Symmetry: D2
């Protein structure tokens, strides 16, 4: 059930350690937590490679849409990694595609998408993506 | 998406740490409201198979569009309806509104597949459950 | 265990589906989230313009909790609050959580805020309007 | 005074998440207790053989506390130190401290108590041997 993206389809990977409370009452990682992984993977990259300044930066990215399909369960305390790529890169917006893998492993357990719009921090009006971010996002394309 | 498109409403209060570093409810928390809105209904209305745990719903897909920000301590209202109702699965449509207001701040959906506890093998939706879901179409 | 009449301020707080952990009861970290929500709601409604506009903020420097009886989604909780010690820059809150129809708290704890200038995190005298709000919660 | 690395027996890195940071821009005080929960249960499952899915005996938290000395923020790297202070018939007191990568003095330090109970009834039980051994391995006379 449902075509499962492979590792080679993603341009950048990031390990994320699972926490006790990632598990829900059914004993696996709750479906809401995947979106926390998405947020974490994307912004870590933006901080590290795009020079995103989340404390005092004048430009920030806001999530305007997200989705996720869940293929196979994961559980604390398993080790997981996020694969990340950029699909469409617009003037002020960017579309990420993500997948979660059980480490060293081939087929994604879950895969989804989300969109940042870049905005003036202190107004929240859409801005053209600053170059240093633009180049970090492009590095993740195709 | 407007208030009158949804059939069932649940108020939810925000918590302090709902806000993220940019000062609004983090996008991830909206999914928690989605779940809390649905599972509150299922728990209060969904039958003994739901209530006792022999039959459980697992989320297999979800999504969300964000139109306008909310922030702790704002009180929110979740609107809910059921779109498709299959043999063992259901697709929910939700929208978050601020009190008094017609236009949604945020709107999405998700699917439960219903399954036996032990096996996670898909099961036909129990009748009391089915009734409760059909009531939201 | 603590009783309702030992506190000065009460607020309901509803649970969420994923408050529950793997063992089926509200996870023990969520109780601190309640403490913070209860105190910060009070501060926002009563705390003063220096709180309300954000030049002065409270930071948590210690906290603790005793857990007596479990809580589970979708149970609704009554938070009792009082202020124990009120210093120059800092305040100790005492909280207890109650379920409808148990006399005794299911859980109780405490935490300390230090008030600080937000842009620098340096401790400040508690602003008057805030201090007044806090004093009103001293037994 | 802040606790030091050398005072702890067992260490566990935890990756910070986007939403760990609160509106003041650092890791919220509440999240520290998720680190406590995470560090302790990882150890019980990996070294103690705790079975969180179908085990008959589980640990429940009966008290916990924390002191916070210096802030940390996502996306910093953090490590939990762990030792066992008191070890009783059915209960155990853990001492934990959070350290930034390659820093000797704790950012925060606290404790929590597990009582071990039969899962179905929550009645306290003698700690199972295999778990007791794992806990005793974290006690030092140093």
């Amino acid at each position: 059930t449902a075509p499962r993206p492979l590792r080679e389809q993603y341009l950048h990977f990031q390990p994320i350690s699972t926490r006790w409370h990632d598990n829900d009452i059914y004993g696996h990682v709750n479906n809401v937590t995947y979106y926390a992984f998405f947020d974490t993977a994307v912004n870590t990259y933006l901080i590290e490679r795009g020079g995103l300044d989340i404390q005092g930066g004048e430009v920030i990215g806001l999530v305007v849409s997200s989705s996720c399909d869940y293929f196979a369960p994961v559980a604390f305390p398993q080790r997981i990694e996020m694969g990340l790529r950029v699909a469409r890169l617009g003037n002020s917006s960017v579309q990420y595609e993500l997948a979660l893998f059980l480490e060293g492993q081939r087929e994604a357990c879950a895969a989804g998408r989300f969109v940042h719009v870049f905005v003036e921090r202190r107004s929240s009006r859409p801005v053209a993506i600053p170059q240093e971010l633009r180049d970090a996002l492009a590095a993740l394309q195709s």
